[PDB]
Symmetry: D3
Subunit: 92 residues, 6 copies
């Protein structure tokens, strides 16, 4: 139970909701940008369940799957780009 | 440097990077903001630094990057929450 | 075949490595079981989490205790993302 | 996280809740925090959480064993994925 | 890949440039096809991507590499997985 | 920068060394092949010390910089490729 885990720890569960809510409602970014970031980060972190959920919300808000593929592509690029950064350690 | 060791792949990579960077479905502001979040989400300090300054020199404010960072942190915790449901039978 | 198949010696040694860490007496069994589950969550391996969770449950640990251990791992993942978040500064 | 008012506040509270949860002892949470820090390879977090654990009375050997569990799980999870090789 | 090629359908400009990147690194002359195949499998395992593993394992099998040599490739991924953790662990000792 | 760790737990340490030797001395793959895979995985997992260490041993055995840079390249590819796989959870 994705939330059954929450029932077990009442106090940490509600405090986690406040944190989620606050970051979800923060006004410095448009809802669209925050939704795009959520999907892109879910892909970067490689969490299939999270990606589906955030993507479905992104769709329900008007974001196309094409713009979603672009956010995913950015995550793919950073994934490769960071490996390259580590790659320079092959040199003495 | 590293790229230097391999001419062909380095060129292809450069092209792949410019392609996703020059994509027209998302504005410049959203792509830069996403680059910072992903960098933070995958914990690469070198990547985060470079993309953050690329975004700062494009008008994006520190506070806006902190919010982008916040989402990444939420996803790192959220993703673990999902795995945590596996403690049940 | 198996997770540990085709390679007899590497499989034998991995098991002994597992046994060594599992019977290391500087920590109690309960703590090692809780650490196992917490670590499985942090690394996001579902099958690992489920298996280590069953072993802990069989040893009397509660799913509430297991939930708190996974909660610590959730916090570590969000904290670590924030550590890299302050790499630009 | 001084930059975002409610987010920082709200995160701080989430942290305190996890840190104060009564189902596990302080000792057990100190070992977990360190082992988890090792498992996700965050050196800064490992340092800080190991510092706190040592100041609480936990020895380096105890901390090392916690870390050995983390390494075991990292190796173990990859082998779970290696089963895909065998179709 | 109905799911990965559906991505090709959404972003032809980037997916294509990526397929070219994949091919460049896939056809480099520095390493033999055998080495690149084993490396692809072991890395898929180290990064814990199930689909990637199955996929590269097949191309490795269809290339004549045995499951035995492949299991050893993974075994090294596992070793590096554990070794990297222990490196982070030294941060414990002050 | 990982030997201090082994020190505290003598048994676990020798136990890890045995495992390390069992994989290092596996006949199914050549030494050159084993050294290339160690460097690439070190990059894939993004552990610098590991990359540095394994690369150095690889250089001493005859493998060149360019061959290692290629190894790391496959790692960059797979790191990006595994993200592309997750992105498939978007098309719903």
């Amino acid at each position: 139970g994705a939330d059954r885990f929450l029932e077990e720890l009442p106090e940490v569960a509600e405090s986690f909701k406040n944190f989620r809510e606050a970051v979800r409602s923060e006004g410095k970014l448009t809802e669209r940008e925050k939704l795009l970031i959520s999907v892109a980060c879910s892909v970067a972190v490689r969490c299939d369940a999270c990606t589906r959920r955030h993507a479905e919300e992104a769709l329900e808000a008007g974001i196309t799957e094409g713009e979603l593929a672009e956010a995913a592509a950015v995550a793919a690029l950073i994934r490769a780009g960071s490996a390259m950064n580590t790659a320079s350690a092959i040199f003495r």
